[PDB]
Design a protein around this nucleic acid. Structure first.
Lengths: 64, 130, 394, 94, 348, 353, 97, 64, 130
RNA sequence: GGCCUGGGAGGGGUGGUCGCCCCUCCCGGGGACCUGCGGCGGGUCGCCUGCCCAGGGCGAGGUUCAGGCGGCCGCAGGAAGAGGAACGGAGCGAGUCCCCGCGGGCGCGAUUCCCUGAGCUGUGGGACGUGCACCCAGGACUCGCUCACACAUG
RNA sequence: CGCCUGCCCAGCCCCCGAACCCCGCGCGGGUCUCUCGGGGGCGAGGGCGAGGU
């Protein structure tokens, strides 16, 4: 997978083929993680996402 | 370079190994690569930890998205395995004897290099919680 | 001073005083189809609300999921049919659909509609879509200006053929070059296009038009109609985890960040607020007649697709406007719109047609034998009724 | 062998084992898939495999016959088709 | 070899260094295993320690003794004891019972020092209550244990909360207070319960029916010992000068009174010979007193192990070895180390 | 000086009243009510509650008995039992505040307790993991009572935290946030089974009862006795007015609906809350939602169930906004002012004519 | 007496104070009765279900052992079986619709 | 009993088993004083709580 | 050392005894305990102040919560009994030959330490009152 | 699937204003209310009907799952003009359920009533006298009594 | 091929080399889809003249 990105000042994705930003830091991979329906690590993912305050519920609420 | 790699870091990448502990871990991995004791990648490490193996699980702190390997920390805590985050993904793969980056490897013990393994293990067991 | 404030709180009298100034609302921050409810033109205020439905955001979790959708970020192994089948299995729900088939190795925006939101899938499938792909050229090119000129050339209404059938027309509205790498002969392009545009075919045509030849390395959908990749986008892990958290911790919080009500897809459309008595009639397939209009938005035009909503902000149906805004404001009677697609279930609101004044009058005349059994005139009908009552069946 | 032939298009730069051609057919009429392409003397060059570009101005690639080679054709060299394997824009446009 | 206190006991190695780890540590008695293989010691650090019989005895200077096991409790250890029918030939018999503050009655394996079993005593509210005393039956089938106004009887075979409850105080009548010690008659089918409420009680083994209730003591009773005759037995108390001699015949009143200095709220132990002729007791002053039971018990000897309280004394069942535990609670002021010791008491 | 105060510093249910949606600003004020903080001491106590710090010997029903001797009142309730040896936050509602006890008893509690382990564990992290395991919806057997075996039931633990661990005494402090009716003694038994060493709850203290906590407004039993004494002997209310708080403080989380003075007495007599009497209404009123209906002086009239949403209220001109759940205010606090309105007058006129 | 058949109740985890703690692994996540006899696959009674605890879909249970049994006997991940009439459905404990 | 506490810099109780806080001050018992309903020392408690400005009526009034 | 205990004092712990007066009071308590002429608990001290038994009432200035003993100062002022605070409850218990603390002690007069008693009494009554 | 059908005008052939066939030009028609769900849009050996020699085979048709990606057919619900400015409430009391770990809690007296126990414990533990106050309040259902039957006065 | 063991084909994951591409003056240096070769892990979709009851 070649497609990478870095976030703009506006907040949107700037797509790129390079593995570093103009400002030095690493570009994230554009594609989401692989998923399989047999996954039984929901407890595990939630447990540590709570610890570091990165669970989706704990973020600022969206504008509707 | 170590201090520069903190800019690239991941939200869940703690406890992070120190500059010196990072150096010790790479050399323990390289010794384990020669004896073919390590297990590399999520698929293998997840399989072997579930199967019943024990050792030290070295995670990469540059990994994104976090969903690829954020289940592993708790898999260790269920079986009391020690784990630690090192700064880079590319350095972990180079130390593991691969030409691609790697997000996680598990180092198993061996009679060849127990002195270096024990220095890492006890220092990693001593690491404070975030 | 904190203590000075505390002292005033216990000493001096507080009262919401009377005033003569006009009461002005601010509905700019109200959710979804209730946003700027104040700015809609008001026909009447006189009706009886029923207390049967709910505000779309605050439906009970079962009803919330059944009337909802997921802006999914599709993963890169499975097919789009397999992805929605997983979501159907996870949420423990009967039916699921999606906003456009992404190929197994393609990622990005896939609006997965759940149960009763699956009535919108045709509208979502026909919506305009944006892609970010990588074309891999077989031979070298002078520079990235040439590949941009090829994308400039293929901006417009194009001929296209499916991958391995008939020739088809597909418009590409806008196209752009993000960057090009001469070493590995890969070029990122972004394209906005109509639904059903084949991007594999576009990559081949870019290759032929340049002369070097080419194919699609990889693809990602960044937009699917109204939803984008920076708008509430969620992964298959989130969907699984949010359901699990609801099962094991009895916590709906995560589900309500994952799933959104179908009304969020319809926010672009012009609104027609119906009276609570008229709601279930329209769900049964009635005409949207003028007696039941409470409010109507500015700039409705003839043959325009409008969303017809309740006073609580639920979507009743998508509908085609027969009257303009100016006509609705001035006319006495008539058909305001006709149904395109009924969203809301039957008997969500109770069955309250045939109780009105003019409807009850017609029922009485049929009972008296002044009209026929099928509500049609006779020779004996009064000239007042026969002239005034504009039967819409005609 | 065709009874009569009508212009198909002019030669554009070659591709890998094909020749790309800009269409200049009368009233923009679109050629059929897998239709035989001919020279001015009714000698078949190849067969039309892919058709692409905008509805008014479009291109077509020709899968060459085994005898021909892509490099041999001159700049703006004209090519032909039988009129029975052409279609109007009004089929595709609406 | 046979016991003889015609001469002062000769010194034999003890342990002092490990007890000095904590500040103001002190021993809380010592007890030989009933086969005579090893000695068990309690201490203020809440660590039971087992010391093997010195090899240098059978093999002169002796090195400082080191315990083969340390088995840690998390709270004050109220009572502890060897299994009644222990032999070092059988791993199934070699184990140590132990009760502690707000904890179950733990059973510790005397070879490996692992937690082997747990007996649990709950009140009517289903809250755990700790046993202030422990005693195995002479068959080794049952584990008797004392509480406030009640004895419980756990079956040794089935470890858990299951137990036969025996109330000693019913409608303000009977033996009141915390039952601080239990002991069984070698000959008769009975057991004696001492309480921190001044009184002694005798009870039939099979039923738990009261046989007698005895006064005498002026403080809370801390220890009991039956004579190998079966008729005669002895008792001692905290902050109480007299060690009272009793008899199952001519009951109701103590036959004799033996003086000893006890000026603290401590379980100052005392012990008989295996033959039953001598009786040894510690003291808060430090002086270990000896009486010949064979009339009133005649004073034989008094000697000083150390310049400190001698809380524990234990006599070895086969050999002529006296064990002594030392130490007591130091009391502060606004702004000698304790020790186990062995002593040869054999004849010339 | 009230003119200088921002509306965010107005007391209790009048706080941030200007951010409620205004239906109409006109009404006729009546000299009837007071602000809840300025109620005459008798009425103040009869509509009040105490955020008590329960002592460690008596049962929770004994404590509330003692409070009703001291203050000389006939009724009290108590926001969920604390067991005799347990301390901490016990909301004691007095007289007319006892109408609110179900809302207080059903509220989420927080506890700080000590578990005692019966053998050693590896360390504090092992106890911390067993607490994470017992987060979420748990099975718990309710204790036997009068030989009536209650069935196994489910109770949620929202959060858990391991505060401290002492390896010497094998003692561990935990903090638990949980649903009402959770047995924390049972939690410590399970936490011991999960570790494998065994365990018992050594100690317990409730640090929160829904809206009230130990952080602020909490008083001991001595304050209650002492405040009453000062009122009895020196006729000073000052101490009592810091021990007792008006029941409006318990209702500050609820969505509000402000009513005209004309409507107040009608609602107290059992009339449904109609739309022509609504002055102001909060954002986020849903159907079948429990709301608080208040006067313009900030007094709670009743707990009501909303039959119109916020948006529906904005569109309509008449009709049932809410039905009563429980009337708080007494009848005839305000005068009867119903039947005087335009439509209601027209109805009575056209019946007579 | 011995039941006609027995269904998988759960697997052995660590012992705890002379009774055995077991992870529950029933089909359809069914919950056992209190004091329900626990059998090994040979249909021999080892004990009775004492405690039931943990999350709804990942719960444990302790087993008060029989007169003749000892907690040291059992090995890790050893399975235990229950009379299927002595189970209840999870739906019972989940809230009313 | 066993529970103690000390206040942090924002006035929240920080519970602990240890008799001294991290700054060397003594920790308070978490539990309130034992109460008797037959207590006749109300005069006495008011008398000296007034004297040392620590009666509840003399403190800063709470913001409601 | 004395100044460190001064951090732990109550709102109501005045008049606090001087460093040397604190030492005199402890030495007087030691002699009174030896003679069996003190009362230790609030439970006890309260009972014998009610009966009207005279003595110097020594209080621990670090007692919390103050509700346990804050009635006693006024009980003394009703009967004109001399009272005084001292830095710590642990030292007050230690003065009476106890490892556990106590918040109050009342020293009775007696012949064997009558001069030491009068020396303490004289300085207690001379203290400035808040 | 090289769509289907009717009328008028002109030219050619054949037979007894008439019938039939072929070509060219012009014009009309292919209808049947609204909504929801399902099916068709080659290839599923899983079921049924039919055909052939508790079994086997088949170029046809159909139902229920699985798979692939507007038009017609079938079934079901309606045949809808949109009503109602007191509807049908409250507060108490009782019976029955739910809630529901509650002999323990409090005080005083005398041998300082005993006790710094290693036993929790002096900021409290116990003994004996003695007295005292606790064991509800809520919610739901059901059958009474009281107060109203209220659209909130520009 | 009822069951079990073993072997072969297909599919999935990891490492190395060659060709191709890019840069410099036959040579040197640096990357990546597809294709070819080698090594390691894994049979129940298909096949088997082998072994066991």
């Amino acid at each position: 997978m070649f497609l990478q990105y870095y976030l703009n000042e506006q907040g949107d994705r700037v797509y790129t083929l390079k593995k570093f930003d103009p400002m030095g830091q690493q570009t994230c991979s554009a594609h989401p993680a692989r998923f399989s329906p047999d996954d039984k690590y929901s407890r595990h993912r939630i447990t540590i996402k709570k610890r570091f305050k990165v669970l989706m519920t704990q973020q600022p609420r969206p504008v509707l | 370079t170590y201090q520069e790699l903190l800019v690239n870091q991941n939200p869940i990448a703690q406890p992070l190994a120190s500059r010196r502990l990072t150096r010790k871990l790479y050399k323990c991995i390289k010794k384990a690569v020669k004896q073919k004791q390590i297990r590399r990648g999520v698929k293998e490490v997840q399989k072997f930890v579930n199967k019943g193996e024990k050792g030290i699980m070295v995670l990469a702190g540059d990994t994104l998205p976090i969903e690829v390997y954020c289940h592993l920390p708790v898999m260790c805590e269920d079986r009391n395995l020690p784990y630690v985050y090192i700064p880079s993904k590319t350095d972990l793969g180079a130390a593991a004897g691969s030409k691609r980056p790697t997000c996680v490897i598990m180092v198993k013990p061996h009679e060849e290099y127990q002195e270096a393994y024990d220095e890492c293990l006890e220092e990693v067991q001593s690491l404070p919680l975030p | 001073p904190e203590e000075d404030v505390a002292e005033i709180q216990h000493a001096e009298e507080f009262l919401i005083k009377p005033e003569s100034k006009v009461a002005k609302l601010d509905t700019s921050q109200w959710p979804l189809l209730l946003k700027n409810f104040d700015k809609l033109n008001v026909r009447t205020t006189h009706y009886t609300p029923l207390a049967c439905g709910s505000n779309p955001l605050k439906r009970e979790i079962g009803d919330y999921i059944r009337t909802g959708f997921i802006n999914l970020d599709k993963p890169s192994n499975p097919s789009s049919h397999e992805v929605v089948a997983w979501i159907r299995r996870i949420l423990r729900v009967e039916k699921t659909g999606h906003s456009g088939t992404l190929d197994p190795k393609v990622t990005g925006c896939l609006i997965v509609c759940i149960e009763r939101a699956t009535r919108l899938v045709k509208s979502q499938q026909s919506a305009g879509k944006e892609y970010v792909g990588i074309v891999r050229l077989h031979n070298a090119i002078e520079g990235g200006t040439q590949l941009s000129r090829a994308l400039e050339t293929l901006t417009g209404a194009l001929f296209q053929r499916p991958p391995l059938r008939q020739l088809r027309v597909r418009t590409i509205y806008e196209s752009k070059m993000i960057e090009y790498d001469p070493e590995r002969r890969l070029g990122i392009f972004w394209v906005s296009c109509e639904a059903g545009t084949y991007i594999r075919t576009l990559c081949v045509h870019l290759g032929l038009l340049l002369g070097v030849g080419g194919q699609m390395q990889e693809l990602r959908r960044v937009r699917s109609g109204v939803m984008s990749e920076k708008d509430h986008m969620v992964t298959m892990h989130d969907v699984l985890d949010a359901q699990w958290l609801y099962d094991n911790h009895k916590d709906e919080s995560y589900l309500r960040r994952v799933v959104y009500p179908l009304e969020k897809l319809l926010t672009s459309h012009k609104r027609l607020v119906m009276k609570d008595s008229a709601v279930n009639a329209i769900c049964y397939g009635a005409k949207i007649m003028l007696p039941g209009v409470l409010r109507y938005e500015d700039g409705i035009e003839v043959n325009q697709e409008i969303v017809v909503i309740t006073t609580k902000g639920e979507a009743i149906c998508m509908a085609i406007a027969l009257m303009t805004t100016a006509v609705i404001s001035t006319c006495d009677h008539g058909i305001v719109a006709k149904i395109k697609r009924v969203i809301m279930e039957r008997d969500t609101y109770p069955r309250k047609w045939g109780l009105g004044p003019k409807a009850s009058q017609k029922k009485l005349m049929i009972k008296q034998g002044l009209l026929d059994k099928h509500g049609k005139p006779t020779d004996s009908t009064p000239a007042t009724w026969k002239q005034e009552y504009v039967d819409y069946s005609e | 062998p065709p009874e009569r032939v009508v212009l198909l298009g002019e030669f554009l730069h070659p591709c890998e084992d094909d020749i790309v051609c800009k269409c200049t057919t009368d009233e923009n009429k679109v050629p059929y898939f897998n239709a035989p392409v001919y020279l001015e003397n009714k000698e078949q060059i190849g067969k039309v495999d892919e058709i692409f570009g905008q509805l008014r101005d479009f291109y077509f690639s020709v899968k060459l016959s085994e005898n021909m080679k892509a490099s041999s054709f001159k700049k703006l060299q004209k090519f032909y088709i039988d009129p029975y394997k052409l279609l109007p824009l009004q089929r595709f446009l609406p | 070899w046979n016991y003889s206190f015609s001469q002062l006991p000769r010194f034999l190695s003890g342990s002092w260094s490990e007890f000095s780890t904590q500040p103001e540590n002190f021993l809380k008695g010592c007890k030989w295993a009933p086969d005579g293989s090893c000695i068990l010691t309690n201490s203020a650090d809440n660590i039971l320690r087992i010391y093997n019989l010195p090899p240098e005895l059978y093999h002169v200077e002796y090195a400082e003794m080191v315990p083969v096991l340390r088995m840690v409790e998390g709270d004050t250890i109220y009572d502890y004891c060897w299994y009644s029918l222990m032999s070092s030939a059988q791993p199934d018999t070699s184990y140590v019972a132990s009760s502690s503050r707000e904890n179950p009655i733990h059973i510790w394996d005397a070879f490996t020092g692992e937690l082997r079993a747990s007996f649990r005593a709950y009140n009517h509210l289903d809250e755990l209550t700790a046993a202030h005393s422990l005693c195995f039956s002479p068959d080794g089938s049952q584990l008797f244990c004392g509480f406030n106004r009640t004895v419980r009887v756990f079956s040794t075979a089935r470890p858990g909360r299951d137990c036969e409850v025996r109330a000693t105080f019913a409608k303000k009548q009977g033996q009141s207070g915390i039952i601080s010690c239990i002991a069984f008659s070698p000959a008769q089918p009975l057991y004696a319960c001492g309480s921190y409420g001044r009184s002694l009680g005798l009870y039939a083994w099979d039923d738990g029916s009261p046989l007698a209730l005895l006064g005498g003591h002026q403080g809370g009773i801390t220890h009991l010992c039956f004579h190998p005759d079966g008729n005669r037995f002895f008792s001692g108390a905290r902050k109480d000068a007299e060690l009272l001699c009793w008899d199952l015949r001519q009951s109701g009143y103590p036959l004799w009174s033996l003086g000893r200095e006890v000026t603290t709220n401590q379980r100052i132990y005392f012990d008989l010979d295996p033959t039953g002729q001598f009786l040894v007791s510690g003291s808060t002053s430090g002086a270990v007193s000896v009486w010949d039971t064979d009339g009133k018990p005649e004073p034989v000897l008094s000697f000083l192990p150390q310049k400190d309280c001698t809380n524990g004394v234990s006599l070895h069942p086969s050999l002529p070895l006296l064990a002594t535990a030392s130490g007591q609670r130091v009391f502060p002021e606004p702004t000698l180390e304790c020790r186990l010791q062995l002593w040869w008491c054999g004849g010339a």
